[PDB]
Each structure stands twice: as structure tokens, then as C-alpha cells.
């Protein structure tokens, strides 16, 4: 297939590597690829992350010095102040440079075109799927995790091979996979699933305690308990990562399970048609836009959204309910 | 009729001209003004054109002093960056002053409220039809070319003679003809062709293309013959522009002109609707607005759809036939 | 893939040709093959025609006798007349013969079955995709030019061979190229193009004149120079011709770019459905049966609507300016 | 205004001219220009008419021997079969003229070019409107008549003159009136009456006979009494003609008045809708494209509604009643 399993170490050898951001994800990666015989550097301005990475033996110069002492640079830091760091400080560095390599986790802020790199440029991704937690969690076992690849630009003919070695230095293999891919195939996927099923989810519980207290007579302390209060989802998110998530369903009821095949082969024609809405509004480049602007508004929106939920009533109820139990 | 042939030229001698920009247009202009002995000089930043303009025997000074010096200026540069230049280097310079008059070459900016000059000033219009490089192959020949006049601000009651004598110093007339009209009515007609005419033909080429080979079993490489690889639609533009849209038809096969006018006069309402919405859409101001925004947020969109148009199929198989013609 | 390049020329070498009609096509590929080494002669009814090409060296005799001398014939007349002609004056000859050969240049008559030769006879195909005043213009520089090839008839198994030997012998090829596909494949091609995107772009034009002078106060003289009384079009449709259509806007504006994208993607289902209908009703035959009919009634519907094109008002002042203009 | 009122008739003093029928109208108009001093002659095949009119003092010859000895000639036959005398009898003799003159009655067959007369000719008309029996008893009075005329061709720079001196010689003028106006704005109106108001008077009668007995119980011997069996309408008619239509209802009782100005403007917009329908489908000529197919197909579809009609029930009734008050 088009997977990879494990693969090279050597482009990597005799070069040095520059870590920016030492939040998750950088702190994790730099001390695994540490271990693993690499020399390695960290590029953050002066707060809590400085004095943490410098403590846990790790030389600490600020931005653009890191990137003239480095022939490749991580650049794990939020999609949203990523772009005025690469403009004032990265990109002038980079423009006085011969051989050089960028990585990203993301490709948000590339696949939509709000940075572009010169050609002098070896562009590249590496996406895990993975929070940062359960990560070192495995890599104390040996254990791989799972990650995507891709290539959007390649002045050097090695890119492919550099980003083999990344996934390596990193422990996401052996042991795990990596996928080939594009930035696209990744920036929708992170937002799909953001703009699909969860807010779905969330809409549909919503819906479900409004009607049953305002129509049935129901109480807001019983709802609550059947819908979420309980551990119930998490039961079965774990047996669908580990069974699968229809071989999950055999350990329910017979009644449960032919009401909810019934009622998925019923309603599959209208999410179908809601997904196709997004996905489109996103593969044109809209809802950067959309989020741009309103960042360039001042989030009102935003704001008044986190307002009119948490002043809801299943809101209060939960919040009176968790203090009952004693969840904090 | 509202048409003009010739006028006057006397406004103008005794006076200092600056020319901002030497793109295209600012070259022809000011190379043909200056055979029609007037004092002229220029403007523009220390780039590729400066050097050029100063070879070709102008006096170059940067902008801001060119207005000094200048009793009349022409604000040659796009319609995208011609703001900032306004608000930085000329407003001020403009407010010091005591009759200056200020030509367009467009009326966007000005039509849409983006620039609004003082009551001192006389602001104009001068528009040409002609690409550029076709005006010169027609001034040699002592040929004029038409072009469009407007007023928005006099503050001398001499503006229009002001335009004839630009209009006369250029060399669109005589030769050539002009007209009166406003910056609406042409900030208007210059974009309804570019929101009208030419992606519904794109369009319909497009589908035509991909119809014929997933519904009909044809090669791709014909139906590129058949639709734009061959040269056939300059031929018909030309017929048009010198013997007329209609009686160009006389020259085809009666077949070809049943078909034509009997789905012209049957797909004509249609468009009709179109075409009322998109200048409904201009006419109020909300493209502009759009389009700056869209400028603001990073050219997402823009993006986007460069990638979508090159990414087709249409396209792909166009680069290999136009290799395989030996066309470049 | 499919295409043809070159190929021989033998199986011509011995025998006689026959070119029906002298007019733009006959003329042209007559005296080529004759300068590639080829016994030719000519079939045509005494008048203007006939004297022009027995003055050019032809020897000339009316059609069934050229018929009976030939071994092979090129059936190149209007579409129009065709039928009467074959009828009258071919089809018997033809049913006296052993061994012959039949080309058109169109497949309109044969794919709807208006003309349905025996079975003793090889039916084939040779279309050129130019007008023919530029074709001479080519072939003087050695230069090809681009054909379609088709066969509906092989009762020699030779076919083929004779359809790219004529290819030959007109001076297509080598320089220019050589399709395979059906009279079908043809006749749907050379009629989509007279009902879709042809009279869509002259009713799309017809609306924005019509609205900006009834809606927004704009002159007549104004917005026909911006929609084609100006060379713009001749401009686009040679840069496609060259450079690709997409790759032709990058030497204009952005803003031109951004709404032609944006509005090219948003129209494009509509124009879509019609083209399918269009297409529909051709690979049916019904639009033959139509206008077949109109000629046996008289063109009536022509007459009017002829009338109805040019009595309109944009066409009077079309008139008007091109007088003007001195544009004869 | 636009009107006529007299003329003068110097033109046709010294000419010669012939009159092609001998029905209702070539009759009347030609004893009548007899009667006002003109030479006249006839053009028919020998039949009844032959015999009639050589009878009351015509000089009879058959139709091309007519053309040739005439400078002006009238062509009063049906639009059905105008089409094949004129082409196999007149336009030869017709190709062999100098200074002509040809006449109709009736603009069909020229308005939608099924006869295309050349250029050496004048193309006029004059369209009376009354039947022909009545014209007669009122140019006995002195009494003119109105009619219509029009011009398709000027090749003399006379045309008006000669029209405007034929309506003098039939009688229409003075004591009538004339109007000038076109070929097509008479076909138009000659066929409006006959697609709009007609068609649905007759439908709206049958309707409500219909409704009347399989509804209410009511007896065909009343419905048709109260309908038209009556001479109800002829009263109205001539009322109409005489004081207006509207001034006509003041002889009429209240309830009448209200009822019918009611119910009129409150269905006006659906007729009005049914008019435009129809009025468009003429003007392009679609109309008589149907009915010379029919023509050519044997006339299937008017049998069957011939039949349809005469053995409807409210036609066996009428027989019967008409039969019982003796009305043959
Ligand atoms: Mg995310
Ligand atoms: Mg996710
Ligand atoms: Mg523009
Ligand atoms: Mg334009
Ligand atoms: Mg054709
Ligand atoms: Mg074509
Ligand atoms: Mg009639
Ligand atoms: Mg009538």
C-alpha cells in the first residue's frame, strides 16, 4: 500500500535541528529525538516555556537565532499567530539562506496560502494524531503512533526522505505508521471533523433534554444522567477504538441495536448532504476567511456564543447537578 | 450627438505635467504628449521603469515631488496600490496647494468613496479602450482611438476643456473619438464584462468539454480542437469588430446561423437575470467591499481557485496537446 | 495514445481522384495533393467555378462522369445540397461499380442517415478543424495542420490505411496531426458549438447593453466600446489560442481574476443543464428532422428572425458608430 | 395623424392593368376602377369565373399572357395556393420586366418570405376590411370604406403614390379612410382575431352549455335559446359598431352593467396572458411553418376536429331545434 513502517536516519546526521515552541507537542518531540542522538536546539521568547526548556537541558537562544544556527526548523507552534512570527522574524533569515527545510504539524495556514515560502525551500508536514499526553504515555512502551506526510514544494529531491527520518526521530515509528498526504487531505480533515459530527452531537443532546423536559414532564437531574452525566459515551468511544464500532454493538441489547440501525440507514441522506455543504465551503478557501475576519473584528461572536451557551438552561442544570456529585 | 471629434489645446501650454507610473500606459501617454511639445517629467520609485524612463530622455524625480512641481498630474498605477500612495505622499503635498487638477485613468477607487480629494482640486477622467501595445501600432499612423470623459469636482468651471485637451494631447483625436460619461459608467461596464460575459463562456466551454467525454465516449483531444485549440473564435472576434457582430454571420453556413439565432433568442432571458443581479451586486458598492476584504484577509480564496482551474482535467490535457503542437 | 502523426501514401499511387465542388475546401486540398504527385481531376456544374479551376490546370468534367473515372472521390459541397446531388446523379453510378472509395468532410448527412451508401463501397471521413483562407497560409511554411478521421464502411479492410494516406496528401501531416473517432463524434462537435456557448455569449452581451442603457442611464456609444466594438475579444482568443486559456489571465489585473474565477465556478451548473439538453436533443436527431423540415416550408422562422436581429436597437447604433468610425 | 383621406390618381392614367381572380374581390374592385376610367383586364384559368367575367365586359386571357401585357396587376386569390402561381406562372415573365408594380391583399405569404419578389419591383398593399358583398352596397351611396396599406419595396421612389392612387380607384376613398402601416401588422391582426377571442367565445358558449345540463338539470332546448339561438349578439354587434362598445350597455339593465364590468376586470390579466402567448408565437413565424406541414401531411388533424365538433352534443341539438323553427 502507499504506508510506511519504518525507514532511514542518516539525512540527519551531522546536521542541527531548531525546535520552535516548547508548548505539547515541542516539548514532547525535542526530548524524544534528544534521546534518540540528534543535537538539538529550542527558539521561544522569554516566559514560563523559556525557563522550563532551559532547565530540562536544553540550549535556549530566541527565534531568528535559532534559525541561523539550524539547518532544519520546527515550527510547532498555534495556526494563529504563526504568520506575523514568520514574517518579521523568520522570513528575512530565510531569504539569506542556500539549503534549508521547514516543517510543519499543520497545514492550515499553507494549503490556504496565508504563508509561501521561496523555492530555495524544502516544505514539508508531519501531522500525528495524537494529543501530546497519551504520546509519551507510549513512548515509554516502545510504542509507535500513528502520523500524515506530505511535500509541497521540493528543491532538493530528498524531501520524501527527510520526512521519514522526522517520523523516526520523533519514536511514531517503528512501532506505528505513516500515511502519505497532502496538506489539503489534512487541514480538512482537522476541520471536519470540527464542523461535522461534534457540533451534531452537541445539538442533538441539546435538543433531546429541551424537548424531554418541556414536553414530557421530565426533570433536568434525570436527563442529564441519561445523556451525558454518565459515563456511558466514553465506554463506548474506547470499545469503538478497540473492537471497531460496529462489533461494539454486540455487547448492547437486541432492541438497541435495531433501533439504531434502523435509524441510521434513515437519516444518513441528510447528514450526507449537511457534509457535503462544509466540505465544500472549506476545499474554496471560505472559512479561512470567515475566521480571519473575525479575528480581525475583535471575536464578537465568538464571545456572545460563549454567552448564550453557558446561560443556558441545560448549563445551570449540569452546573447545580456536578456540585451535587461533588464533581469539581 | 454627446460625441467628440477635435477641440482645443490651449489650457495646457504654459503648464508642467507629471506622469505617475511608467507601466504600459504611462509610457505611451507620455512619450506621445511630449512629441505634442509639452513639458512633462515623472514619478516613480527607484525600480526597473525608473531607469527606463530617465534612458528615454524624461526628467525623474519620485512622486511626492513630482507634485509639486506639477500643475496637472495623471495617476497611471492599479487600481489595488493606488490608495496608500494617495494618503501617504500626495494628500499632503494636495493640501498645500491652489488649483491643481488630477486625471484617472479609472474611476473605481473615486466611484466607491476609496479616495476623496479636496474641493480645490478639479478631478477628472480619461479612459482608453485600447490595450496599449495597438496604440502606438496606430499613432504611427497618425490614427486616433476612442476613449471616455467624466467630472466629478470642478472647481474652475474648465474641467471638461481641461479633458478635451488631455483627450487632444495623447493622441485618441483627432483620429479617434471621445465621450462624456461619469466614473460610475465606467467603473461599471469595466467590471460587468468581467462578471457577465467571460465566465459564462469559460463555463460553458468547460462543460461542453467535460459533457462530450464522460457522457459521449470522446477523446479528450478533440473536443480541444474543436472548442478553443483551434483558432477559430479570433477569427469570429475579428469579423465582429470591423464588419459587425450579426452580419459576421453571413460568411458561416445556414445551419450554423439556424442554431445560433434560434438558441440565442431562446437562452436570452436567462442571462438577462444574471446580468441584472451582478450590476444590481455593483451598482451598491458590495463587490468593492468584498474584494477588499478579501485583500485584507490574505487572498484565500484566490488561492484556492488558481489551484482548482490548473488541477482540472481540462487543463491537463491541454498541457499535454499544446507540448505536443510544439506551442510553448 | 490514439494519435497519428504521420503514415504512407501508397495506396493511392496508380489510381485517379476525383474533387467534387472547387469552392474554399475543394480548391485548397485539390491543389495540394496535386503537388504531392497525384492524377486528379474535377466535377462541378458549369458556372464561375468551373472556369477558375480549368484555368488553375484542371481538367473538368461534370459529376457522373468524373464518378465513373475515378476510383476514389471527395464529396466536398454544402451539407445542404448533398442529398439531391448523391441521389440524382451518384447513387447510380455507383450501384455500377466493383470497388470504390467515398470521403466527406462532414458527417452531419451520414451519421442522421440521409445519405446511406451500399455496401460495396468504403465510407471514411477526413474533417479539418480550419476555415481554409489560413490552411494555404500554413502549408506554404511546410507546415500541418489538425484532422478528424472516421469510418463507418470497410468492405476492403483498407480503410483506415486510405483515410491517413489522404491525410497525407493534403499536407495535414507531418507538421499537424491526426485524430480516429466516428462521423458521430464529429457532427455532435460541430453542432455544440453553434448551440451553446456562441449564442449564449451574444445574448449575454445583447443583456448588458440592453440593461445598462434601460436601467443605468449609459449611452449607446459607450457600452459597445467596452463590450466588442474594441479588439478586446480578438486579444483573449488569440492568447488562448497560444498560451492556454487560464495561463491567458495572468496578464490581466487581479481584480479581472477574482471575479472571473468567482463567477465562472458559481455559473457553472446552469449553463451545464443546458448543455446536456442541447446534446440530448442532437444525439437523438431531432434537430435534423427540424431543420429539415423549415426548409421544406419555406424558412420562414429564419426570414423573421433575421429581420427581428438586425431591426433591434443595439444593432442600429452598432451602425451608426461603425460609420463613424469610417469601419466600413 | 397618420391618416388618409383623398389623393390623387394621375399615376394609373395611360397604364394598363390586369386583375388575377375573378372571386368575391377581384370582381368588385374591378368593375369599380372600371367604373373610374381605368383600362382593365383579368387573369384567370378558364372556369366558371372565366365565363362571369367575360361576360360582364372583360377582356379574359390567362395569367402570364395578363403580366405581360400589364404594368401593374393585382393579386387577389387565397394565401394557400398564391405560392405556386406566382412561382411557376409570374416570376419568369416577371425576370423579364423593367418598371413593375404588384399589389396584395394580404401580407401573409410575403410578411414570413415565402414569395420574395426581386428588386426591380414595387411591393405594395392594400388591405380592405369588409367582406365584399357589403362593399358594393355601399358604393352605390358614394360611400368609401377603410383599408390598410404598406410597402415592402421601393424601387421607383412612387410606391405611396401608386397606393394611395389604388385606394382611390376601388372606391375606398374619398368617404372612407386609409391607414398606412405594414405587411406584418396586418398579418398580426388577421390572425390574432382568429387565435384570441374567437376560439374562446366558442369555448366559453360550449362550456357553459355544457355545465348548465350535467349540472343544474337543465334542458338543451333553453341553454341554446338563451346562448345563441337567439339573435341576441347580432343585436350587440351592431349596437357596437354603431355607438361604442361601452355606451352600447347603457340600453342594458343595473344587474347587466355590474355583472359584466365586474367579472371583466377581474379576468382581464389571463386573457391577457393567453394574447401575449399567441401574438408571440406569430411574430416569429412558428404559425405558418405548422400549418404548411399540415399541408404537406393531408390535413389529418383539421378532419378530425371538423369531426369532433359537428358530432358534439350541442351540435345534434342545435339540428333538432333548428330543424323544429324551421331555420334550414
Ligand atoms: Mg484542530
Ligand atoms: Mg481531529
Ligand atoms: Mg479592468
Ligand atoms: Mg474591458
Ligand atoms: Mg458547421
Ligand atoms: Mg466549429
Ligand atoms: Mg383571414
Ligand atoms: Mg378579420
Given at each position: 500500500d502507499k504506508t510506511v513502517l519504518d525507514a532511514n536516519?542518516?539525512?540527519?546526521?551531522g546536521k542541527t535541528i531548531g525546535v520552535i515552541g516548547y508548548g505539547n507537542q515541542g516539548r514532547v518531540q525535542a526530548t524524544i529525538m534528544r534521546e534518540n542522538g540528534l543535537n538539538v536546539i529550542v527558539g521561544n521568547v522569554k516566559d514560563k516555556y523559556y525557563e522550563l526548556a532551559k532547565k530540562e537541558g536544553f540550549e535556549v537562544y530566541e527565534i531568528d537565532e535559532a534559525v541561523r544556527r539550524s539547518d532544519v526548523a520546527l515550527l510547532?507552534?498555534?495556526?494563529?499567530?504563526m504568520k506575523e512570527v514568520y514574517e518579521k522574524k523568520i522570513a528575512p533569515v530565510l531569504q539569506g539562506k542556500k539549503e534549508f527545510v521547514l516543517d510543519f504539524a499543520s497545514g492550515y495556514n499553507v494549503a490556504f496560502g496565508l504563508i509561501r515560502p521561496p523555492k530555495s525551500v524544502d516544505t514539508i508536514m508531519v501531522a500525528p494524531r495524537m494529543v501530546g499526553e497519551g504520546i509519551m504515555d507510549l513512548h515509554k512502551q516502545g510504542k509507535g503512533y500513528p502520523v500524515l506526510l506530505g511535500v509541497?514544494?521540493?528543491?532538493?529531491?530528498?524531501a520524501w526522505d527527510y520526512a521519514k527520518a522526522i517520523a523516526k526521530g520523533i519514536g511514531a515509528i517503528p512501532g506505528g505508521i505513516a500515511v502519505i498526504s497532502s496538506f489539503e487531505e489534512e487541514a480538512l480533515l482537522d476541520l471536519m471533523s470540527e464542523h461535522t459530527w461534534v457540533p451534531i452531537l452537541f445539538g442533538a443532546i441539546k435538543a433531546c433534554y429541551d424537548i424531554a423536559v418541556k414536553?414530557?414532564?421530565?426533570?433536568p437531574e434525570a436527563a442529564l444522567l441519561e445523556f451525558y452525566a454518565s459515563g456511558e459515551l466514553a465506554e463506548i468511544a474506547r470499545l469503538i477504538a478497540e473492537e471497531g464500532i460496529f462489533n461494539?454493538?454486540?455487547?448492547?441489547?437486541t432492541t438497541s441495536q435495531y433501533g439504531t440501525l434502523t435509524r441510521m440507514f434513515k437519516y444518513y441522506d441528510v447528514v450526507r448532504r449537511i457534509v457535503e455543504n462544509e466540505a465544500k465551503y472549506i476545499w474554496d478557501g471560505s472559512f479561512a476567511k470567515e475566521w480571519s475576519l473575525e479575528q480581525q473584528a475583535g471575536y464578537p461572536v465568538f464571545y456572545r456564543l460563549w454567552e448564550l451557551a453557558t446561560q443556558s438552561e441545560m448549563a445551570k442544570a449540569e452546573k447545580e447537578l456536578y456540585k451535587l456529585l461533588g464533581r469539581k
Open positions: 536516519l542518516d539525512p540527519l546526521k510547532l507552534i498555534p495556526d494563529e499567530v509541497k514544494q521540493d528543491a532538493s529531491g530528498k414536553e414530557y414532564g421530565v426533570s461494539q454493538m454486540v455487547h448492547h441489547s
